[PDB]
Amino acid sequence: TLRAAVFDLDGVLALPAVFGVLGRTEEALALPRGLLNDAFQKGGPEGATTRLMKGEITLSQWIPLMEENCRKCSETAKVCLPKNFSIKEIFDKAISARKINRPMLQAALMLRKKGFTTAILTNTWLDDRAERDGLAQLMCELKMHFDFLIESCQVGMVKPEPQIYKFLLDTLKASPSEVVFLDDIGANLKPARDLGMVTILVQDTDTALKELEKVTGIQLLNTPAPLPTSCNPSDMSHGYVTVKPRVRLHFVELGSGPAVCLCHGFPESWYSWRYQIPALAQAGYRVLAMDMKGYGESSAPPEIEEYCMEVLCKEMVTFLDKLGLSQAVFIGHDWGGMLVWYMALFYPERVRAVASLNTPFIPANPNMSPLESIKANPVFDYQLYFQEPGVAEAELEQNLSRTFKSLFRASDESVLSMHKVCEAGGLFVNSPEEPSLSRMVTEEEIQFYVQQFKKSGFRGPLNWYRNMERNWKWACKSLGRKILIPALMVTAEKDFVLVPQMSQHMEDWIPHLKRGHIEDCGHWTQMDKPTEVNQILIKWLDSDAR
Amino acid sequence: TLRAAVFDLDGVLALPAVFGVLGRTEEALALPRGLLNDAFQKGGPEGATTRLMKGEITLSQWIPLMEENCRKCSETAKVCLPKNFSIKEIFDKAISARKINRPMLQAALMLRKKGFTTAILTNTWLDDRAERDGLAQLMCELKMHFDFLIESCQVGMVKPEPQIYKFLLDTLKASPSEVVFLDDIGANLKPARDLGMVTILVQDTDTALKELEKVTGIQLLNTPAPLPTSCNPSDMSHGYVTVKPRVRLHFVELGSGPAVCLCHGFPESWYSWRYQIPALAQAGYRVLAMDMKGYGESSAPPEIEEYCMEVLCKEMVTFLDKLGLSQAVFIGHDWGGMLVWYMALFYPERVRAVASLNTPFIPANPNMSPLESIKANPVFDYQLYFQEPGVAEAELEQNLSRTFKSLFRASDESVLSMHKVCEAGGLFVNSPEEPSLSRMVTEEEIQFYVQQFKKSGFRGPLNWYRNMERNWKWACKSLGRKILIPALMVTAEKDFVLVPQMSQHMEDWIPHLKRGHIEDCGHWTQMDKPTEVNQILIKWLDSDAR
Ligand SMILES: CCCN(CCC)S(=O)(=O)c1ccc2[nH]c(-c3ccccc3)nc2c1
Ligand SMILES: CCCN(CCC)S(=O)(=O)c1ccc2[nH]c(-c3ccccc3)nc2c1
């Protein structure tokens, strides 16, 4: 019974293959068929390419050797190489043209998710070309999805030498009959077959996947659309900044490029951005996903005023200063969405662009207290419940698993009513003791939140609702301003607290506002519709945030 | 007696001033003298500029108001504004031209170092122009050197209103007679004078500094060249990556731009890069200063093999992968210099550029064991002392303060002999028990190292010398390679272990090698000659690392 799947890079996980471009170059230059491919393989195990694949020489040291082989080959064929024939040029664009074979990676990912140990086995070189980064970026994206990456230039062995196959079985901790091996080269497939491995000769991906699905018994073809890549907490880089004595801010960091600060809502974690962090980093951004003040590994002082918008904003400015960042794109959801609008209002020079998910920007009414206007809308009764220090903490901290299982639900899964929470005497009053596990979350994801909330509980998180009057007074000072920096508002159709209609007057204050909208999406936008969230944010970042 | 110094931004800390460009624009366009300045101040406390300075409106909302004031002014003067008169354009280049007044910041820094509480008090706006980053970068660089930054648009008060002066005294916790106030505008100086503050009317910086030096009694003019900005450990962002189970890597991070990985030597810390971290970040790089394996807050497994070059290099590759970094510039010193050459030799696709301080690149002799070649040079006897597990740890860990005080010394300060350490039976045998404090380090800097080394001691650090044979065998596989990626070698004249002559044959293997050289510099390059190290690295990074 198969338990490991081994994939080649060139012609299997990466398309098009180099020897396919070697053939396309022969045709384009009207050279004899196989001339360039014969030059490439010249001297077999004793030649220039074998030395390169074993790591004896780098790619640059190899170029003039491939040049001489092409001259010597063209001399025997009694042909002429063109005026400006260049191996450096041919190989540069061949490497550059090569992209990930998306259906093949998806099947590799399906196999791994279903218990298989996966590996990439490749005949590759030490790339020291000035353009090496393109390949380095390609390898980084592929390697993260596999248990092993075996490169010929790193092990000093090559395919089809039987030693690399014996090396592969040892790293896999599997006997041959337990391994599926996918290769585009028949000669490199033969030693795996000889040992007793299941082998697939890759030509077109569809035929190879049909063969792979039949042999594994796992459906790889015609599968439902997969969720975006998520985060494993212990595989992330964890950052920590002291913004003031006894107040420390925790963040997860991934990627290079413009700084993208992600600000979660109530009662969440940096982990709420799990499906955005890899996608946004892959899109060419340096993601800094916050544990907001009061949450996770960040400091949770007990005083209410410590959570007023003026203090939180000033602290995010200090966070930027301490990391040596003149600007960041601020993307917020829920309470994070609110903070993000205030960062744009009060510190526009530190805000590259601003994006909110569900949270609209509504100017303060100077002729009315916010505490008396909360009462005007029946949906916001839970806000009044959240007011008295102690009450909601006791209910929310009682059974942590029940809290997140009850809250983290889709549009068609509600167990709790948003209205008359005060009259009922709680948020979980006519709610089950053991709520069913929502479709959006696994048991593992709920437990990550459970463990996070054991450190400081709900006092710090609840204090964000406890600065209404203080927040109002500060917001009133911004009444003559306009948001003129690039801004995005993302509405969610089925969010019944942060309703899309609440965002309708936004253009009066943000005239150049760009919009996004998600249908059949509840309040927990990021985990409800991660593929949609990623498309909207990436499209907006590349057009408006550089 | 003065204890606080308050500085204005425009015309004091930042040159040239805006109203100087307003006058230069009048001349260039042949407009009546003061026309643009009269337009700017139109309506005094009830006008457009006062609203902008108080933060009622943003800069962009202000542009069309300044436009109307210019039209109305030009109408009364009975003149015509040019065909393509634009306030946006005038202000854009005025803000852009404005740089830090370096002698003024240096004096502000001298004052702070000598006990003064320093502050910037400025009449400024909320900048929401598409070009706002230039100013945001200017403010970031200045603000870090002061105890306070008071901005009119943030406090809702302006100079010359006496409330801002009363606000300044409160934040300073000082009475007027304790404060020096430097301003280029006489009108904004008058309320500080009225309260009883020492005031300096800034015109030319030299005259103002002569006045400031006379009144404080502190020498600010004709001072010796200051050391570059250093790091306060608790003001840094601290990053943490798990590279494998039970092996975690700690780093300090500052700045945005290309990733610059700094690799310290034996027996050091990320803190050895203290004078490079701010300079390199200011130069437009994202600095990642490592605590190498075995050191500080990074993991120190006890096994020798865990510190072999193959393992350390593989772990730095994992460090890059986990942070989502396809490449980094690798800058190493001492043992870090060695690692850095091996990263370029084994993973050139992950190495943007490579730089070594003191450590040359010498290829492995395949016809000789390194353990028998260490004996060929008398300087490397301490290496033989470092071999037996336990011996050197006991001596180095005995008195931590004595260890760093004895080791961290300049060329003209040696207390320990590099030769016959085995015969003497130790590194500190004929060395003082209470060594004098070297010129390169303060008591505080030595104690940071003392506290760092209390966690794991010297086992992990010493194990880097305990993989000679293992390292040799791995290095032998690279014997046919060449370093063809951008590379820098920095030699130090008075380093008597890593002598500049040891680097002479390097071009045979690194043909495009760029060089650096530091005269009257010992082994501890970074702290011995920080200004020189910074100049060499920044010049090389901007030409070769982008
Ligand atoms: C009274 C107006 C309501 N909000 C203003 C929206 C412009 S609010 O600032 O009080 C606010 C903001 C974020 C919120 N998030 C939630 C929330 C409630 C239950 C579960 C999760 C989030 N309630 C919120 C209220
Ligand atoms: C035998 C050759 C010596 N070195 C090779 C230089 C190409 S080494 O790799 O053993 C080496 C490397 C870094 C070192 N650093 C020190 C050192 C000694 C005392 C104090 C601080 C550093 N000794 C070192 C030896």
Curated annotation (Swiss-Prot), chains A, B:
Q: How is its activity regulated?
A: Inhibited by 1-(1-acetylpiperidin-4-yl)-3-(4-(trifl uoromethoxy)phenyl)urea (TPAU), 1-cyclohexyl-3-dodecylurea (CDU), 12-(3-adamantan-1-yl-ureido)-dodecanoic acid (AUDA), 1-((3S, 5S, 7S)-adamantan-1-yl)-3-(5-(2-(2-ethoxyethoxy) ethoxy)pentyl)urea (AEPU), N-adamantyl-N[']-cyclohexyl urea (ACU), 4-(((1S, 4S)-4-(3-((3S, 5S, 7S)-adamantan-1-yl) ureido)cyclohexyl)oxy)benzoic acid (c-AUCB), 4-(((1R, 4R)-4-(3-((3S, 5S, 7S)-adamantan-1-yl)ureido)cyclohexyl)oxy)benzoic acid (t-AUCB), 4-(((1R, 4R)-4-(3-(4(trifluoromethoxy)phenyl)ureido)cyclohexyl)oxy)benzoic acid (t-TAUCB) and to a lesser extent by 8-(3-((3S, 5S, 7S)-adamantan-1-yl)ureido) octanoic acid (AUOA).
Lineage of producing organism: Eukaryota, Metazoa, Chordata, Craniata, Vertebrata
Q: Which named protein is this?
A: Bifunctional epoxide hydrolase 2
Quickly give the catalysed reaction: an epoxide + H2O = an ethanediol; (9S,10S)-10-hydroxy-9-(phosphooxy)octadecanoate + H2O = (9S,10S)-9,10-dihydroxyoctadecanoate + phosphate; 12-phosphooxy-(9Z)-octadecenoate + H2O = 12-hydroxy-(9Z)-octadecenoate + phosphate; 12-phosphooxy-(9E)-octadecenoate + H2O = 12-hydroxy-(9E)-octadecenoate + phosphate
Entry's localization field? Cytoplasm; Peroxisome
In this UniProt entry, the residues modified to Phosphoserine are: 369
Q: Does the keyword Lipoprotein apply?
A: yes
Q: What does this protein do?
A: Bifunctional enzyme. The C-terminal domain has epoxide hydrolase activity and acts on epoxides (alkene oxides, oxiranes) and arene oxides. Plays a role in xenobiotic metabolism by degrading potentially toxic epoxides. Also determines steady-state levels of physiological mediators.
Going by the UniProt record, its keywords in alphabetical order are: Acetylation, Aromatic hydrocarbons catabolism, Cytoplasm, Detoxification, Hydrolase, Lipid metabolism, Lipoprotein, Magnesium, Metal-binding, Multifunctional enzyme, Peroxisome, Phosphoprotein
Judging by the UniProt lineage, the source's domain of life is Eukaryota
Gene name linked to the record: EPHX2
